[PDB]
Design an enzyme around this catalytic site. Structure first.
Site, PDB file in Angstrom:
ATOM      1  N   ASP A 117      49.248  33.150  39.189  1.00  0.00           N
ATOM      2  CA  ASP A 117      48.500  33.371  39.793  1.00  0.00           C
ATOM      3  C   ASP A 117      47.345  34.359  40.045  1.00  0.00           C
ATOM      4  O   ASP A 117      46.670  34.960  41.107  1.00  0.00           O
ATOM      5  CB  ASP A 117      47.832  32.446  41.214  1.00  0.00           C
ATOM      6  CG  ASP A 117      48.302  31.066  41.052  1.00  0.00           C
ATOM      7  OD1 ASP A 117      47.929  30.452  40.353  1.00  0.00           O
ATOM      8  OD2 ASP A 117      49.394  30.810  41.684  1.00  0.00           O
ATOM      9  N   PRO A 135      42.473  40.384  41.293  1.00  0.00           N
ATOM     10  CA  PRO A 135      42.220  41.565  42.063  1.00  0.00           C
ATOM     11  C   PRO A 135      42.596  40.914  43.746  1.00  0.00           C
ATOM     12  O   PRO A 135      42.790  42.430  43.876  1.00  0.00           O
ATOM     13  CB  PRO A 135      40.848  42.084  41.590  1.00  0.00           C
ATOM     14  CG  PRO A 135      40.716  41.633  40.173  1.00  0.00           C
ATOM     15  CD  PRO A 135      41.384  40.153  40.354  1.00  0.00           C
ATOM     16  N   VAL A 183      46.025  29.059  54.511  1.00  0.00           N
ATOM     17  CA  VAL A 183      45.537  30.287  55.718  1.00  0.00           C
ATOM     18  C   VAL A 183      46.309  31.338  55.558  1.00  0.00           C
ATOM     19  O   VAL A 183      47.353  31.298  55.251  1.00  0.00           O
ATOM     20  CB  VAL A 183      45.487  29.709  57.290  1.00  0.00           C
ATOM     21  CG1 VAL A 183      44.706  30.725  58.329  1.00  0.00           C
ATOM     22  CG2 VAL A 183      44.247  28.515  56.880  1.00  0.00           C
ATOM     23  N   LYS A 242      51.472  34.286  56.033  1.00  0.00           N
ATOM     24  CA  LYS A 242      50.414  32.657  55.485  1.00  0.00           C
ATOM     25  C   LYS A 242      50.631  30.908  55.947  1.00  0.00           C
ATOM     26  O   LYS A 242      52.668  30.763  56.321  1.00  0.00           O
ATOM     27  CB  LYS A 242      50.528  32.596  53.943  1.00  0.00           C
ATOM     28  CG  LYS A 242      50.016  31.771  52.959  1.00  0.00           C
ATOM     29  CD  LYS A 242      51.166  31.538  51.498  1.00  0.00           C
ATOM     30  CE  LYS A 242      50.358  31.113  50.885  1.00  0.00           C
ATOM     31  NZ  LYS A 242      51.144  30.898  49.701  1.00  0.00           N
ATOM     32  N   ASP A 264      50.917  37.029  46.939  1.00  0.00           N
ATOM     33  CA  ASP A 264      51.201  35.143  46.834  1.00  0.00           C
ATOM     34  C   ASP A 264      52.090  34.875  45.562  1.00  0.00           C
ATOM     35  O   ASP A 264      50.808  34.104  44.833  1.00  0.00           O
ATOM     36  CB  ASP A 264      49.102  35.008  47.067  1.00  0.00           C
ATOM     37  CG  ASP A 264      49.732  32.950  47.593  1.00  0.00           C
ATOM     38  OD1 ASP A 264      50.556  32.659  48.637  1.00  0.00           O
ATOM     39  OD2 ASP A 264      48.448  32.725  47.940  1.00  0.00           O
ATOM     40  N   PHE A 321      52.558  44.044  55.653  1.00  0.00           N
ATOM     41  CA  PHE A 321      51.247  44.548  55.846  1.00  0.00           C
ATOM     42  C   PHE A 321      50.646  45.397  55.290  1.00  0.00           C
ATOM     43  O   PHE A 321      51.005  46.245  54.899  1.00  0.00           O
ATOM     44  CB  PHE A 321      50.716  44.585  57.805  1.00  0.00           C
ATOM     45  CG  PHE A 321      48.652  44.355  57.820  1.00  0.00           C
ATOM     46  CD1 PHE A 321      48.404  43.024  57.333  1.00  0.00           C
ATOM     47  CD2 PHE A 321      48.070  45.414  57.883  1.00  0.00           C
ATOM     48  CE1 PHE A 321      46.951  42.838  56.877  1.00  0.00           C
ATOM     49  CE2 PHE A 321      47.179  45.702  57.819  1.00  0.00           C
ATOM     50  CZ  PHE A 321      46.046  44.040  57.545  1.00  0.00           C
ATOM     51  N   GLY A 326      41.600  34.943  55.996  1.00  0.00           N
ATOM     52  CA  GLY A 326      41.138  34.275  54.883  1.00  0.00           C
ATOM     53  C   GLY A 326      41.652  33.160  54.982  1.00  0.00           C
ATOM     54  O   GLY A 326      42.938  32.581  55.332  1.00  0.00           O
ATOM     55  N   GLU A 327      40.760  31.493  53.773  1.00  0.00           N
ATOM     56  CA  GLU A 327      41.613  30.573  53.913  1.00  0.00           C
ATOM     57  C   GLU A 327      40.827  29.888  52.899  1.00  0.00           C
ATOM     58  O   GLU A 327      40.290  30.334  52.430  1.00  0.00           O
ATOM     59  CB  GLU A 327      41.249  29.850  54.785  1.00  0.00           C
ATOM     60  CG  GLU A 327      40.186  29.326  55.942  1.00  0.00           C
ATOM     61  CD  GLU A 327      39.533  28.897  56.162  1.00  0.00           C
ATOM     62  OE1 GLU A 327      41.124  28.331  57.283  1.00  0.00           O
ATOM     63  OE2 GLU A 327      38.220  28.228  57.365  1.00  0.00           O
ATOM     64  N   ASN A 354      44.773  38.994  44.320  1.00  0.00           N
ATOM     65  CA  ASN A 354      46.477  38.774  44.590  1.00  0.00           C
ATOM     66  C   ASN A 354      46.930  40.366  44.270  1.00  0.00           C
ATOM     67  O   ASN A 354      48.046  40.876  44.402  1.00  0.00           O
ATOM     68  CB  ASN A 354      47.311  38.327  43.868  1.00  0.00           C
ATOM     69  CG  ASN A 354      46.771  36.478  43.526  1.00  0.00           C
ATOM     70  OD1 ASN A 354      45.664  35.982  44.060  1.00  0.00           O
ATOM     71  ND2 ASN A 354      47.668  35.382  44.485  1.00  0.00           N
TER      72      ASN A 354
HETATM   73  C1  LIG Z   1      37.666  42.236  52.171  1.00  0.00           C
HETATM   74  C2  LIG Z   1      39.967  41.755  52.640  1.00  0.00           C
HETATM   75  S1  LIG Z   1      40.528  43.373  52.513  1.00  0.00           S
HETATM   76  O1  LIG Z   1      40.054  43.891  51.184  1.00  0.00           O
HETATM   77  O2  LIG Z   1      40.166  44.290  53.142  1.00  0.00           O
HETATM   78  N1  LIG Z   1      41.767  43.169  53.268  1.00  0.00           N
HETATM   79  C3  LIG Z   1      42.334  42.623  54.386  1.00  0.00           C
HETATM   80  C4  LIG Z   1      44.132  41.893  54.202  1.00  0.00           C
HETATM   81  C5  LIG Z   1      44.120  42.648  53.438  1.00  0.00           C
HETATM   82  N2  LIG Z   1      45.837  42.189  53.408  1.00  0.00           N
HETATM   83  C6  LIG Z   1      47.197  41.000  53.248  1.00  0.00           C
HETATM   84  O3  LIG Z   1      46.365  39.859  53.360  1.00  0.00           O
HETATM   85  C7  LIG Z   1      48.218  40.846  53.084  1.00  0.00           C
HETATM   86  N3  LIG Z   1      49.358  41.443  53.657  1.00  0.00           N
HETATM   87  N4  LIG Z   1      50.053  41.544  53.423  1.00  0.00           N
HETATM   88  C8  LIG Z   1      50.508  40.214  53.148  1.00  0.00           C
HETATM   89  C9  LIG Z   1      49.480  40.050  52.686  1.00  0.00           C
HETATM   90  N5  LIG Z   1      49.054  38.472  52.052  1.00  0.00           N
HETATM   91  C10 LIG Z   1      49.481  38.498  51.709  1.00  0.00           C
HETATM   92  O4  LIG Z   1      50.511  38.134  50.531  1.00  0.00           O
HETATM   93  C11 LIG Z   1      48.693  36.654  50.854  1.00  0.00           C
HETATM   94  C12 LIG Z   1      49.183  34.905  51.273  1.00  0.00           C
HETATM   95  F1  LIG Z   1      50.777  35.394  51.540  1.00  0.00           F
HETATM   96  C13 LIG Z   1      47.862  33.932  50.916  1.00  0.00           C
HETATM   97  C14 LIG Z   1      47.451  34.425  49.732  1.00  0.00           C
HETATM   98  C15 LIG Z   1      46.440  35.555  49.670  1.00  0.00           C
HETATM   99  C16 LIG Z   1      45.684  35.785  48.533  1.00  0.00           C
HETATM  100  C17 LIG Z   1      43.987  35.954  49.499  1.00  0.00           C
HETATM  101  C18 LIG Z   1      42.731  36.316  48.463  1.00  0.00           C
HETATM  102  O5  LIG Z   1      43.298  35.246  47.850  1.00  0.00           O
HETATM  103  C19 LIG Z   1      43.582  35.073  46.665  1.00  0.00           C
HETATM  104  C20 LIG Z   1      45.629  34.774  47.972  1.00  0.00           C
HETATM  105  C21 LIG Z   1      47.834  36.993  50.367  1.00  0.00           C
HETATM  106  F2  LIG Z   1      47.389  38.150  49.925  1.00  0.00           F
HETATM  107  C22 LIG Z   1      44.324  41.804  51.789  1.00  0.00           C
HETATM  108  C23 LIG Z   1      42.989  42.226  52.061  1.00  0.00           C
END
Ligand SMILES: CCS(=O)(=O)N1CCC(NC(=O)c2[nH]ncc2NC(=O)c2c(F)ccc(C3CCOCC3)c2F)CC1
Length: 288
Positions: free
Chosen positions: A125, A128, A22, A38, A143, A80, A16-17, A130
């Site tokens: 912040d 859900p 990103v 990130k 995050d 992850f 996502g972004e 997050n």
């Molecule tokens: C349909 C999607 S999913 O439910 O299938 N899914 C698949 C992939 C999943 N994992 C991860 O992102 C993940 N794993 N370790 C760490 C981490 N991310 C993060 O630490 C993270 C970041 F660094 C910056 C921003 C956001 C949010 C982004 C959205 O806005 C609010 C802030 C973050 F989360 C999450 C969702």
């Protein structure tokens, strides 16, 4: 800064972004590890803030593994997790998340918060998206927002009223507010306060909890963005707000949603609430 510092990582998908930057899923080519990346496009305060966060290690906080500055970018390497709470709530929307799993998630997030807050670290912040979940029933804070953001979405729904009223020096209580809004949403399968502007957010809060005044929130009428011309709405009953939550959960939620940050329950006191006498750690039905 310098070049080539991210060559050890192979991006496998852009997750996502947005305003945060990103997010990628990546693989370390040399160690084989699967991580989240990130990317922040380009500050002394932020270096200190981020360094402290790297030291915060807790089962309910997404582990920050490394911080890498290359070119005009700052990369944060995270453990992850495969799904967030928003997707899980959507997937569960027809049946509801069973209460034992709601209670488990709420309990674990309060543990993570009490830990952060004991270090005077605020998330700022919470929503859900997050909150990340795994197959073993864990849920983790992701995050964290910094005291001073940096770098080159209707994130209002979970914002505490003191933030909306212009409080510059707010407290850990803002995270308890956001988590209360998330608690109610898990129970009812609807966002509690789905505002679409800062004033609509505030007025949705007011229409449900009543327009605050000096009796329930001493100092409110002095806050930078309070207007005496705010409409005066009466408070509703929590029985109307989060049915069919039992009275233990309604009691806890009421304390999480107090207007006065001095009265709003702390994460630590919330762990002792009688709602948690029968907490367990169920296994969620997770489709990855
Ligand atoms: C349909 C999607 S999913 O439910 O299938 N899914 C698949 C992939 C999943 N994992 C991860 O992102 C993940 N794993 N370790 C760490 C981490 N991310 C993060 O630490 C993270 C970041 F660094 C910056 C921003 C956001 C949010 C982004 C959205 O806005 C609010 C802030 C973050 F989360 C999450 C969702």
């Amino acid at each position: 800064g310098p070049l080539g510092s991210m060559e050890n990582f192979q991006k496998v998908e852009k997750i996502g972004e947005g305003t945060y930057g990103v997010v990628y899923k990546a693989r370390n080519k040399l160690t084989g590890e699967v991580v989240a990346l990130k990317k922040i496009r380009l500050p002394s305060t932020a270096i200190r803030e981020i360094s402290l966060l790297k030291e915060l290690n807790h089962p309910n906080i997404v582990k920050l593994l490394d911080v890498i500055h290359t070119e005009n970018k700052l990369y944060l390497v995270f453990e992850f997790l495969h799904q967030d709470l928003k997707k899980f709530m959507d997937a569960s929307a027809l049946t509801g998340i069973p209460l034992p799993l709601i209670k488990s998630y709420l309990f674990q997030l309060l543990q993570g918060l009490a830990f952060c807050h004991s270090h005077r670290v605020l998330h700022r912040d919470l929503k859900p998206q997050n909150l990340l979940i795994n197959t073993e029933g864990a849920i983790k804070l992701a995050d964290f927002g910094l005291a001073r953001a940096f770098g080159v979405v209707v994130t209002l729904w979970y914002r505490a009223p003191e933030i909306l009223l212009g409080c510059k020096y707010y407290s850990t209580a803002v995270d308890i507010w956001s988590l209360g809004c998330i608690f109610a949403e898990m129970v009812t399968r609807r966002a509690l306060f789905p505002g679409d502007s800062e004033i609509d957010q505030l007025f949705r809060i007011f229409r449900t909890l009543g327009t605050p005044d000096e009796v329930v929130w001493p100092g409110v009428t002095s806050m930078p963005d309070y207007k005496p011309s705010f409409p005066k709405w009466a408070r509703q009953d929590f029985s109307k707000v989060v049915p069919p939550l039992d009275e233990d959960g309604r009691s806890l939620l009421s304390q999480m949603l107090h207007y006065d940050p001095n009265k709003r329950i702390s994460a630590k006191a919330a762990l002792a609430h009688p709602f948690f006498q029968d907490v367990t750690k169920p296994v969620p039905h997770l489709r990855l």
